[PDB]
Symmetry: D2
Subunit: 67 residues, 4 copies
């Protein structure tokens, strides 16, 4: 076809483009849930670390210098 | 512009969209595979930090009671 | 011989220290637990997320072993 | 008399155990402080794999930089 080929393309390019677009919608629903779930663990860690550095006063300042 | 020009371009941006979509597909497959790796890493290091506590609590507090450990 | 008062007090005292360092080791582990158990629960949250988005965003052909 | 000898050894027994308890509690910290610096190692990896896979997969993201 010369114009059936054309009305075909425009319709597989609108369907292609719509898949990309809203699969883009959920890739960013992914990296948004991802990033702050890390910020959960990074804060659950950063206070598990502090609990250890503070119960580090449970020794002489010589017998535990690390970290 | 015209009808043969506007055709050979659709032909290019449909191929460029199909190539883009397959690229995007095998770099999701890359992301969830290199994520499943680093996450199990995270788990097997927890199971280090957890059982280093599971024993040092029942081993430095003998008479004392235990919370789940 | 009556430097026995001193011995019997050094023994009530050093023994008290160990009774208080036993208070602190009970504290340290009981809130090392709930602080640990937090991390644990962030993990299987951040884990299952990468199990849903690993199959709600991806064909059936990448059955990455790690996810159920 | 002879219990100036039972006490003197009871002290040495308390004093050495108060002591071995201190360097077991010491070894319990050396091994913790290096086991969450394994988990800190893991975290940094997982995060930069999200930064370098949210930037390379999308246009504009929030946390990463």
């Amino acid at each position: 076809g010369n114009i059936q080929q054309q009305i075909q393309l425009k319709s597989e390019l609108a369907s292609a483009e719509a898949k990309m677009e809203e699969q883009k919608q959920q890739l960013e629903r992914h990296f948004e849930q991802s990033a702050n779930l890390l910020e959960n663990m990074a804060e659950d860690y950063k206070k598990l670390y502090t609990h250890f550095a503070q119960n580090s006063e449970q020794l002489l300042p010589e017998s535990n210098q690390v970290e």
